Amino acid sequence: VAKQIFALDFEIFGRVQGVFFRKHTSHEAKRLGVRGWCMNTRDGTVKGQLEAPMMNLMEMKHWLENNRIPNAKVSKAEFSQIQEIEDYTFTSFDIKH
Numbered sequence: 001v002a003k004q005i006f007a008l009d010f011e012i013f014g015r016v017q018g019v020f021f022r023k024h025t026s027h028e029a030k031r032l033g034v035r036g037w038c039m040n041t042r043d044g045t046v047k048g049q050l051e052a053p054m055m056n057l058m059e060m061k062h063w064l065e066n067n068r069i070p071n072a073k074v075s076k077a078e079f080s081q082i083q084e085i086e087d088y089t090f091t092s093f094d095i096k097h
Contacts (some may be wrong), residue, residue, distance in 0.1 A: 006057050007085045011047040012064055014075035021046050022074050022095045025064070034060045038054040039096040048096075051088050 012021070017040050025038050025046065033056045038048030050060055063069070065077035 002055070003053060005051055005085050005088055006054050007049065007051045007083050008057065008061070009047070009049050009080035010043075010061070010064055011045050011062070011075055011078045013045050015071075015073040016046045017044055019071040021069065024069050024072070026093050026095055028063050029060055032056050032059050035090040035093055035094050037090065037094045044070070047057050049090075051085065051090055054082075057082070 022038055022040065025048075029036060029050065032052070034050050034052035035050055036050040036052075038046050041047050049058060052060065061077075061079065065074070067074040
């Protein structure tokens, strides 16, 4: 189960645009061994998806909700349920536009 890959969706609210949030997110995902993507939304949020083994996944989720991201002020982080997936669908972690 420790080499199983799990997946979740996320959306982060607060002062999360105009503060390099996406670059920070990409850096932290990649250094935690988490794949996925994120984007700035028309709602003034950052949304995306993660894929990783459970341990790595939950570390990334912690970082997204712990509110110690430089220059960002996170008012809340929303997540989907966790699902197991057969294999990674993403090669890495990408910022979308």
